[PDB]
Ligand binder design. Structure first.
Ligand SMILES: CC/C=C\C/C=C/C/C=C/C/C=C\C/C=C\CCCCOC[C@H](COP(=O)(O)OCCN)OC(=O)CCCCCCCCCCCCCCCCC
Ligand SMILES: CC/C=C\C/C=C/C/C=C/C/C=C\C/C=C\CCCCOC[C@H](COP(=O)(O)OCCN)OC(=O)CCCCCCCCCCCCCCCCC
Ligand SMILES: CCCCCCCC/C=C/CCCCCCCC(=O)N[C@@H](CO)[C@H](O)CCCCCCCCCCCCCCC
Lengths: 642, 642
């Protein structure tokens, strides 16, 4: 007595439009026979098979398969005692036939020495191509044969085949049926084959016709035909009235992505190129700025030559070419125009960014202004000044232009006095800036954004990898087939965490090497805690993949949910702008985001060298741990009623 | 002769592994007879049906179906004269049965009055639920029944069915076969049934057994049984040898988005939430900076109180509480500490951003410095200066603090002289900044990034919509089902462009209204040309979706390619940083990118008010036009060899 079912009541719905998928069902599968299930649709048989295996549960009734209640103690139905061929092809792509057979043998605890014998026997018997050909390269009919061979490997004592012969050649169908009737010859082997084709299940010892969630009849085909008088079976149906399984999953995980060139480029080559582009374009100071200089103290020759010469010692010859020599050569390029009304016309168009317009009386008026004091007449206060018309449409370019012009005057003022034996401190504003406590006097914007780029890449490259992996595998029936083989959900998750941990360590090493060793981003603090924080953000992002994959069943739905929170989090975590710019109400809400307090903590360890003991540093560690726990709890709650 | 195939040859794959799907196939179908095409696998029969309907082309041989070559304007195989039921369920989700019937009737050109009669007849004949139930809410059998009813509504003179009964109830199978026999007697209707059922296809008037790309035997069932002396058929087989379509497509496209709530929120509620968050967080000035002030001219009372009092007229009583009076109240908060050593300790932690430390004799040292100038002793110059220690780890905050500390001294200096009857023009540096030509003296960073945000949202939300729409729809054979119905490829492309153009028109209105009318981003240029440029970027993005959809065949691959180009373009088109920061070599390459010249053109329209006659403005219009053509050419070349 292999399988016994009594009063199996099962239904679907929410007490609004309920569906009675199952009804009062009594079914017995005698041991050592071939049992055929010939239901009309493909839902009742599938539900019954799932309940028999253990992947589903009843509402009322009992099931007694191979000795005990399915999925629990007292029996080994989920494991190496059963053979399950799913309705759909639940094979792994980018796998050779030999690799798939070896993987499934390892899952069942078989020895690798005896796997070769079964592989050769099944290749000869099922008429399959060379073992080195990948599964994805096979046709749609050979994949079913590979699935049948996988289900027939370990010689189980109960075979559950779901339409094993859909489009098999008759010369092979006869051989398959001969093998099936040969293995179940005075032995413990039992077959429970479900099919839609009525005429193909005549060789079964016992036939059970299913309709409206219950078995119409269950007898031998010969008795079924004789007691009703029908010629064929078509007329009869016209009734108007743990170590070893983890190593198997680790190899599969590290080989599924190795054979996908697109996956490797997306998760290993994209962070590297993004880091290179960010360090070469964002945060650098402008360099090719142009100015329209009008110098009326000298003759006009070209738009690129002026012949600005003077004396360096004393006597204050020109004091207009002398100032231009103190201009920063790196950022500002000088262009010469003849008239003040012509340089402004160049600024109006795109030919320049500003105008200077030194007057012809600049030298005589300037020397008469610093040598007079507070009694200077208004006339000398006008002729001794530089008139700058600036294009302030750009905020960042305007800041450099204003800063470079004023800074060059401080050097010019400190050069005039000092060359005449004076005190250079006399040309200083009373507001004196001492040595900065943190940083330097010339900070860079690329150093402010770099901590926000490291954490963003690692966080969002784990959401995409985890959500895609757990959705494709589940929707293709692979997770359900690798559970029947005895792989508990505990080791499915454990093997995924280890696989994701390794790839998030390789990404962290590549990002940190290309950012600090190359392009010279400063790291004042401890590098050990930087690595730990970066890894911790990867696990937080990975835990977000669990929530997304447990909510969305379709791939396209998950990406919208993942992309629908990627953009808002970037604009609220203070990655590209200081967090002090937002309103006070919006500032409080943003501190509770997953990436806000972690970015600030990482920015302090890189720009200031703060240790773990500082309150602003370990707040980023506690914020991630809370979000990791919160993400895990949400996923469990979602799976409770789904 | 309904169909005449002679000397058919067809090859698939490469030379190394050729695939001879057909080889010297001779087949003839009479008019008014049911024809059954039984085969071992489900690929050669599908290939033959695809060749018959005209989707494919033979490498050698001729086909004459219903009068002439398929799709040659001599015969009307693509259109009303055929009934096609694909192997897969090529139906539209979120469509009621009535809506599906109406859409397919409008495609064929039927009147809405006679579609109702056919719908009511087919609903009762096929035993289907109420017409208001959505297709996606039906089971597999009901969906297949709806697909079968779709092929029977317009009454074609040639029915092509691919496995019409795979899980149909036997009573319904008998009814369907009775109807099929009824419609083909004493008439011109011809039915070609392709099935794996060897025994169910017995009522067909002519059976053609297919094997190895050719027909083993083509004759009547009972004739075959009598000639070969076999009881059943499997024993014999066991031998060892034009505006109505656009209006129908436009309504389908719009209604396919209305019934997807997630899609509407992703393309119409995400840009609204992204614009609002960007305008409230990025670009605004910091307004919470705290400074640790050490004033030794007044007694220490609290950390929040100092009792800063001074005379406003003259006599220069304190000059330390007077300077602090001019400090801006918006950005700087005042804290008081008793010792300079106790103030730096607060800056070293996260309690302050700087220190000031006015000396105990600041008033007399400063007063004696202005009155006695150009000859002040080093003692006075050292005890009349303010010592500022700044935390310069943040570039944007450090700029604000330095700028506000020096701008406040100008107001203090212009108040000290002027209240004593002196001209305030004596307290200005010779570098005099006139009125800016463009912008103002206080620019904003959110105005620099706003032009780049508008283009990025519109361009990159059309790639996602176009690629997904053309990939999911093509994967499930929806294009193949509408092509057989008579919908030319031109009408499919035209209807999608119109639908996308209307979608991108709504997105432009929402983005422009919130950014300009609500958040007050100035538009100094022409508003008409801004809308034109924004729309032109949407078409350019859509054409990039054509390239992605023509290259990739799976959803998970298109987005990796789509996201693989979204990240680099953001860091190379100068959206979040001026293009002047990159090196010259990278600057030349980045110019040719799709969004580089367009962002510059839009920025000059909003920030400067330039018109279309300026070279820097219309260069972004030519860049989009060329990229539109290039993307269309690439998509045609991709489909040429693929
Ligand atoms: C903004 C616009 C910028 C520029 C404009 C345009 C340039 C022209 C368009 C150019 C695009 C170029 C090449 C595409 C080519 C061919 C793909 C189709 C053939 C087969 O590649 C399979 C599937 C798809 O094949 P599929 O049909 O789905 O698989 C079979 C399904 N049964 O491709 C994928 O996944 C690609 C996954 C992209 C990963 C994204 C991150 C990339 C990081 C940097 C890349 C570094 C490259 C280093 C080279 C290493 C060589 C080993
Ligand atoms: C970084 C951390 C950020 C935040 C911290 C978070 C705490 C909680 C995270 C919570 C997120 C979770 C669940 C949300 C809820 C429910 C979705 C799943 C239920 C049912 O939604 C069906 C499928 C799923 O069903 P599906 O699998 O696709 O279909 C199968 C067919 N049989 O969802 C989809 O459409 C995903 C498409 C998301 C569209 C993105 C739009 C982004 C802008 C939104 C603007 C404001 C929205 C206002 C709401 C108005 C409501 C009318
Ligand atoms: C399965 C997909 C799940 C997605 C989950 C995460 C994505 C996965 C890859 C992460 C690799 C690294 C993840 C970011 C790596 C760091 C990149 C960065 O930091 N970028 C910022 C500069 O710091 C950027 O400038 C700020 C955005 C401003 C413009 C926002 C308008 C764009 C919206 C347009 C809508 C298009 C819709 C889909 C388009 C095509």
């Amino acid at each position: 007595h292999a399988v016994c079912v009594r009063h199996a009541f099962k239904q679907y719905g929410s007490k609004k439009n309920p569906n009675h998928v199952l009804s009062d069902l009594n079914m017995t599968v005698a041991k050592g026979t071939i049992y055929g299930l010939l239901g009309a649709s493909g839902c009742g048989k599938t539900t019954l098979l799932s309940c028999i295996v253990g992947r589903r549960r009843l509402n009322t009734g009992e099931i007694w398969v191979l000795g005990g209640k399915p999925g629990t103690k007292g029996s080994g139905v989920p494991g190496k005692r059963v053979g399950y061929m799913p309705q759909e092809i639940a094979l792994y792509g980018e796998f050779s036939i030999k690799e798939t057979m070896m993987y499934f043998g390892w899952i069942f605890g078989m020895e690798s020495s005896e796997i070769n014998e079964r592989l050769q026997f099944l290749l000869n018997f099922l008429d399959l191509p060379s073992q080195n050909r990948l599964v994805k390269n096979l046709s749609g009919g050979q994949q079913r044969r590979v699935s049948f061979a996988v289900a027939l490997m370990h010689d189980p004592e109960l075979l559950i085949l779901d339409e094993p012969t859909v489009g098999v050649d008759p010369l092979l169908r006869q051989s398959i049926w001969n093998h099936l009737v040969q293995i179940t010859k005075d032995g413990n082997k039992t077959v429970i084959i479900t099919t839609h084709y009525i005429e193909e299940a005549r060789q079964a010892h016992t036939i059970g016709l299913m309709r409206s969630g219950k078995l119409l009849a269950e007898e031998s085909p010969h008795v079924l035909l004789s007691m009703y008088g029908c010629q064929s079976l078509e007329e009869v149906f016209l009734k108007l009235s743990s170590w070893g399984k983890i190593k198997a999953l680790l190899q599969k995980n590290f080989l599924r992505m190795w054979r996908n060139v697109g996956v490797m480029l997306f998760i290993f080559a994209l962070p590297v190129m993004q880091v290179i582009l960010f360090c070469l374009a964002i945060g650098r100071d402008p360099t090719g700025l142009k100015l329209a200089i009008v110098n009326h103290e000298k003759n006009y020759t070209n738009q690129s030559y002026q012949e600005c010469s003077f004396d360096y010692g004393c006597k204050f010859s020109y004091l207009s070419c002398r100032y231009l020599n103190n201009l920063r050569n790196s950022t500002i390029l000088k262009e010469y125009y003849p008239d003040p009304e012509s340089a402004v016309d160049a600024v109006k168009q795109g030919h320049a960014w500003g105008a200077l317009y030194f007057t012809e009386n600049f030298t005589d008026a300037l020397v008469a202004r610093m040598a007079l004091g507070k009694d200077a007449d208004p006339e000398t206060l006008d002729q001794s000044e530089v008139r700058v018309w600036l294009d302030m449409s750009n905020q960042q370019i305007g800041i450099i232009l204003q800063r470079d012009l004023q800074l060059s005057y401080q050097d010019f003022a400190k050069d005039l006095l000092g060359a005449c034996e004076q005190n250079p401190d006399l040309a200083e504003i009373p507001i004196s800036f001492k040595e900065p406590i943190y940083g330097s006097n010339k900070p860079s914007f690329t150093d402010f954004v770099a901590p926000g780029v490291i954490l963003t890449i690692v966080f969002f490259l784990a959401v995409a990898l985890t959500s895609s992996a757990l959705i494709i595998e589940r929707m293709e029936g692979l997770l359900d087939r690798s559970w029947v083989a005895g792989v508990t959900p505990g080791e499915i998750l454990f093997s995924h965490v280890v696989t994701q941990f390794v790839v998030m360590c390789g990404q962290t090493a590549l990002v940190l090497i290309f950012m600090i060793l190359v392009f010279g981003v400063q790291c004042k603090g401890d590098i050990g805690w930087v690595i730990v924080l970066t890894i911790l953000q990867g696990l937080c992002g990975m835990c977000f993949g669990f929530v997304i994959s447990a909510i969305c069943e379709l791939e396209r739905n998950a990406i919208q949910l993942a992309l629908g929170s990627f953009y808002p989090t970037l604009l609220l975590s203070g990655v590209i702008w200081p967090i002090e710019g937002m309103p006070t109400v919006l500032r409080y809400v943003s501190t509770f985001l997953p990436l806000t307090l972690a970015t600030t903590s990482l920015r302090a360890m890189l720009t200031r060298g703060w240790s773990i003991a500082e309150p602003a540093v370990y707040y980023g560690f506690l914020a991630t741990i809370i979000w990791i726990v919160a993400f895990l709890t949400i996923s469990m709650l979602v799976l409770r009623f789904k």
